[PDB]
Amino acid sequence: FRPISVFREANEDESGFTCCAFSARERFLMLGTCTGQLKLYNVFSGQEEASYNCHNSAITHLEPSRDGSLLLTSATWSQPLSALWGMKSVFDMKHSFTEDHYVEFSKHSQDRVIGTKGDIAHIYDIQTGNKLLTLFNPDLANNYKRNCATFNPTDDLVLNDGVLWDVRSALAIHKFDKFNMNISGVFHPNGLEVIINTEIWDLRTFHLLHTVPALDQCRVVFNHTGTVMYGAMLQAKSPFGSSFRTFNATDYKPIATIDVKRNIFDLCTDTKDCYLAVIENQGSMDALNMDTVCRLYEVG
Ligand SMILES: CC(=O)N1CCN(c2ccc3c(NCCN)nc(C4(c5ccc(Cl)cc5)CCCCC4)nc3c2)CC1
Ligand SMILES: CC(=O)N1CCN(c2ccc3c(NCCN)nc(C4(c5ccc(Cl)cc5)CCCCC4)nc3c2)CC1
């Protein structure tokens, strides 16, 4: 991990980056802010290139479509809470997800959005904005406090609140046992494994393949090649602490623990997996304003 760049939000007494994701274009990071702005930055110079007010509360999440034409945002305390924006020609809102605190694109063909509202998953059509499905079963719910519903790599399975759903049949296939209070889990990019906190489950057998203690209370993200998995741990103002963990995605063997000594808001990689961008808070929770920086590392 060689530090390559650092910048803060342009012209602010206090810097309000809350989340990031690379665009299509390679040198250009997208960042959310505590004032609900979406901003485009040159990741090397720290130059602010553009600015849009998406919400009147802080941004928690953003996701660009692979084709560069669409963006998902989620906010903290806004109605609507999440939205889908078009980025071809004119930046404009296409649809809004009134009470979904989290949204993602479908993964194989990006024609759908999945939203989370507490313990409930919603799937929408991107073209119409219509709600196609509601995935919830009160008898099977885990009530994870940081539930985030997600599609698998082929878009035909969903994980919501520790329940595996078949999308075609809208049937719950399997409820995974509850072993923690917060983390609901993600699919491995290989399409065969599910990672729920410290447990790695085989999707074909539901056997336990690995325990990874260092993953406790981590939000897990994969690089674009699916070779490396990155975790930041929930704190006991940011949702994360000051360290991130990397693991070999194939054998789950720890690669590195990096303590940046500042609470982390987000991290992401470019599509070529050369760079890791981390949002780090220089201020404490108790500060009047936030004071985040975006730090860019070359991976080593
Ligand atoms: C030299 C070079 O490659 N560059 C040089 C700098 N670039 C720039 C410079 C200005 C941009 C701009 N503003 C021009 C007038 N509002 N708008 C947008 C769009 C946009 C994206 C995000 C946000 Cl938050 C607000 C607007 C995305 C594409 C079309 C719809 C607006 N993208 C730009 C990219 C990116 C790449
Ligand atoms: C009140 C306020 O202004 N703030 C300032 C803004 N805060 C922030 C800033 C960054 C966040 C973040 N980044 C990483 C992803 N982009 N992820 C998440 C979510 C999250 C958190 C923990 C876990 Cl295990 C699972 C999910 C995931 C996205 C939606 C909501 C919960 N929450 C954030 C809230 C919340 C408090």
Author numbering: 1080 to 1315, 1327 to 1390
Quote the original article:
DCAF1 is an essential WD40 repeat (WDR) domain containing E3 ligase receptor of the Cullin RING ligase (CRL) 4 subfamily, and using two different PROTAC prototypes, one directed towards the nuclear protein BRD9 and the other towards tyrosine kinases, we demonstrate utility of DCAF1 for targeted protein degradation. Interestingly, DCAF1 is frequently hi-jacked by Vpr and Vpx, virion-associated proteins encoded by lentiviruses, such as the human immunodeficiency virus (HIV). Mechanistically they act as a protein-glue to recruit cellular restriction factors to DCAF1 for ubiquitination and subsequent degradation, setting a precedent for *de novo* substrate degradation via DCAF1. Furthermore, DCAF1 has been shown to be a preferred receptor in Cullin4 ligase assemblies and ranks as the second most abundant CRL4 receptor in CRL4 E3 ligases behind CRBN.
In summary, WDR binders from a previous hit-discovery campaign for EED have been screened and optimized using NMR, computer-aided drug design (CADD), biophysics and structure activity relationship (SAR) approach. This resulted in the discovery of a scaffold that occupies the DCAF1 WDR donut-hole pocket (Vulpetti et al. submitted). Here, we further characterized the potent DCAF1 binder (**13**), which binds to DCAF1 with a Kd by SPR of <50 nM ([Fig fig1] and [Fig fig1]), an X-ray structure confirmed the same binding mode in the WDR donut-hole and helped to determine the piperazine as a potential site for an exit vector ([Fig fig1]). The inlet with the cartoon depiction of DCAF1 highlights the location of the binding site in the WD40 domain of DCAF1. Shown in the remaining part is detailed view of selected amino acids interacting with the compound. To determine cellular compound binding specificity, we coupled compound (16) to beads using azide-alkyne click-chemistry and show that alkyne derivatization of (**13**) (resulting in cpd (**16**)) does not alter DCAF1 binding ([Fig fig1]). 293T cell lysate incubation with these (**16**)-beads and comparison to beads in competition with (**16**) to block specific compound interacting protein complexes from binding, enabled the discovery of the whole core CRL4^DCAF1^ complex including CUL4A/B, DDB1, DDA1 and RBX1 ([Fig fig1] and Supplementary Table 2). Interestingly, neither EED whose early scaffolds led to the discovery of cpd (**13**) nor any other WDR containing protein (besides DDB1, a known DCAF1 interactor) showed significant depletion >50% from beads, proving high-specificity of our DCAF1 binding scaffold.
